[PDB]
């Protein structure tokens, strides 16, 4: 089933900050804001961790869209191939989640990659989840849903249970 990262990195503070740094031309900015909150809350409702949104500067989880090289040593690659990536919990790049602007993203009402599903998978990594061997899991390695039992099992193994 689920996997974590080697040495099980995790956020050890009671509160972690996040910022949507950059947006996609495919959607309204408010729509990306709401979908990110919804993705974070799928994981957060299961565990004793709180997310605080910020609008400027460097937050613990930095989220955004970019074309090509974008300051980490993992440049995007144009249309197709890599769609997005994210980093395990830690300082600096740790926690950050990046999306390739050279693809087509949707809120479900048009053609595109389902952004809510994509954001839940990437933010999984940002909180310390690796990839699952369970084909039902959001964390399965390849691309209307909810977290699978296996997703919930893993995140609660890493942080404990909320309730």
């Amino acid at each position: 089933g689920y996997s974590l990262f080697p040495n099980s990195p995790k956020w050890t503070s009671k509160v972690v900050t996040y910022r949507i740094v950059s947006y996609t031309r495919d959607l309204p900015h408010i729509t990306v804001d709401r979908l990110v909150s919804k993705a974070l809350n799928m994981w957060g409702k299961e565990i004793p961790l709180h997310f605080r949104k910020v609008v400027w500067g460097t937050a613990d989880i930095m989220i955004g869209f970019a074309r090509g090289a974008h300051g980490d040593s993992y440049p995007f690659d144009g249309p197709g191939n890599t769609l997005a990536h994210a980093f395990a919990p830690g300082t600096g790049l740790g926690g950050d989640a990046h999306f390739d602007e050279d693809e087509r993203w949707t809120d479900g009402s048009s053609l595109g990659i389902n952004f809510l599903y994509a954001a839940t998978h990437q933010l999984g990594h940002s909180l310390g989840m690796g990839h699952s061997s369970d084909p039902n899991a959001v964390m399965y390695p390849t691309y209307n849903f909810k977290l699978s039992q296996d997703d919930i099992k893993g995140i609660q193994k890493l942080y404990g249970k909320r309730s």
């Binding site: 080697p6 890599t82 769609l83 990536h85 994210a86 980093f87 395990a88 990594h125 989840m129």
Partner: peptide, 5 residues
């Protein structure tokens, strides 16, 4: 893609 660093 899950990256480490």
């Amino acid at each position: 893609x899950g990256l480490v660093x």
